[PDB]
Amino acid sequence: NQIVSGAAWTDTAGNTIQAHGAGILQVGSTFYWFGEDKSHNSALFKAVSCYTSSDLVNWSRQNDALSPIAGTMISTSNVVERPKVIFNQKNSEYVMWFHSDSSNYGAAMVGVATAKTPCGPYTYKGSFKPLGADSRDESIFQDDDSAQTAYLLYASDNNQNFKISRLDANYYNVTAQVSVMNGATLEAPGIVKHNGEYFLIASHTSGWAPNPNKWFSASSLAGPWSAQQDIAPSATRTWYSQNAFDLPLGSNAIYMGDRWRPSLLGSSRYIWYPLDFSSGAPQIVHADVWSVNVQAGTYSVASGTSYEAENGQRGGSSTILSGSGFSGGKAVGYLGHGGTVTINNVQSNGGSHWVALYFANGDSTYRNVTVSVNGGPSVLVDQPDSGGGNVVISVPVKLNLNSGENSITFGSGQSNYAADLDKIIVY
Ligand SMILES: *[C@@H]1O[C@H](CO)[C@@H](O)[C@H](O)[C@H]1NC(C)=O
Ligand SMILES: *[C@@H]1O[C@H](CO)[C@@H](O)[C@H](O)[C@H]1NC(C)=O
Ligand SMILES: [Ca+2]
């Protein structure tokens, strides 16, 4: 049980999970992860996937919950985003909502589909504008009152005004507006309850690029909502992610986000972190490797051993850079293109270990770094843009180490410059 944000997560078949824009549903002790299948690197509709698990980590892919229909707004030339599914007790029916759009995002509708079983397949009922207004990024929140009253959370009015509106008793349509934040430019919403209070997590509108996601709280869905506050250090842009789903977990929650990769959408990653409420304000716990016990409502952060890149052995043209965003105030630059750094005396008990690479990449585009263990064949690790040359994020790589001391060499045999390497943490 290791949740490793940024890694290529695979289902029980060993295939990369394709469930972007997550919606989670719990039925009894089984969890259902619905999402966008982007396996052909398209922004257009291929499927709403359905994966099941009892532990939130080992996901078994079922038949797709929603499939395209030519000549409708759920054709393979249209947009189906951010699916969400809730169970209607009155009708014994699962109801899926999603953002339904054209490829230019000019239609701004919701779509609804229904099924008698959690993975369906679902039957599409049509798309519409809620109360006649725009809806783009959306979520569905189901309260725990007696009626299990449900709400659409949505970016409206050309993304400018954020709305919460109550659904009818069938969950088929929006009946009344409940809250509006005019001019808020919020998207990617989700709500999770905590000690009877409602917590809204949302991003701002920066297109595909990540931005600092925010939390708001209220004692009623009608508000008043608190003023936005950060869930993560602002410079990290939510640790390079965008909110997708906020799952309750005991007295805390799990932040489930997407790391969108526009040039390779099917390789967009899943950024899941504990959302810790112990201070009364929710905050992402930046845990490169953590474990979850969904039955206990608990999480456990793995401990690792840190090695500073600047304490490694540089070869060729690599150099030491100084900056306030780096651990130890220093990083190794000019890696790749003839510069290397080798971190020696990496202790291990043997076997396979997750290693987090902390780097800064001030480009607008990705870099990568070659990684070789004890002189073995290199693997190439993608290094997203980090937000600035003085902003560090981490990405994980699983390395086979030997008992005793090990060496890890970065930047050998690549023509391009890698990102600047701050440190590594070996878990
Ligand atoms: C949904 O509810 C609204 C407001 O109550 C109503 O005007 C509308 O006819 C209903 N149906 C649809 C498809 O919007
Ligand atoms: C590695 O990074 C360079 C840019 O520095 C890029 O041109 C190249 O396509 C990347 N390689 C892979 C496999 O992504
Ligand atoms: Ca450092």
Numbering used by the authors: 22 to 448
Paper quotes:
In this context, exo-β-1,3-galactanase (EC 3.2.1.145) specifically cleaves the nonreducing end β-1,3–linked galactosyl linkage of β-1,3-galactans to release d-galactose (Gal). In this study, we solved the apo and liganded structures of Pc1,3Gal43A, which reveal a glycoside hydrolase family 43 subfamily 24 (GH43_sub24) catalytic domain together with a carbohydrate-binding module family 35 (CBM35) binding domain.
The crystal structure of the SeMet derivative of Pc1,3Gal43A was first determined by means of the multiwavelength anomalous dispersion method, and this was followed by structure determination of the ligand-free WT, the WT bound with Gal (WT_Gal), the E208Q mutant co-crystallized with β-1,3-galactotriose (Gal3; E208Q_Gal3), and the E208A mutant co-crystallized with Gal3 (E208A_Gal3). In the catalytic site, the vibration levels of some residues were significantly different between the apo and holo forms. Tyr126, Arg157, Asp158, Asn179, Asn180, Gln181, Trp229, and Gln263 in the liganded structures showed smaller vibrations than in the apo structures. These results indicate that side-chain fluctuations converge upon ligand binding. The catalytic acid, Glu208, has two major conformations in WT and WT_Gal. These two conformations were also reported in the BT3683 structure. Thus, the movement of this residue appears to be important for catalysis. Based on the results of ensemble refinement, Trp229 showed huge fluctuation, especially in the apo structure. The role of Asp158 is thought to be a pKa modulator; therefore, its function and conformational stability might be related.
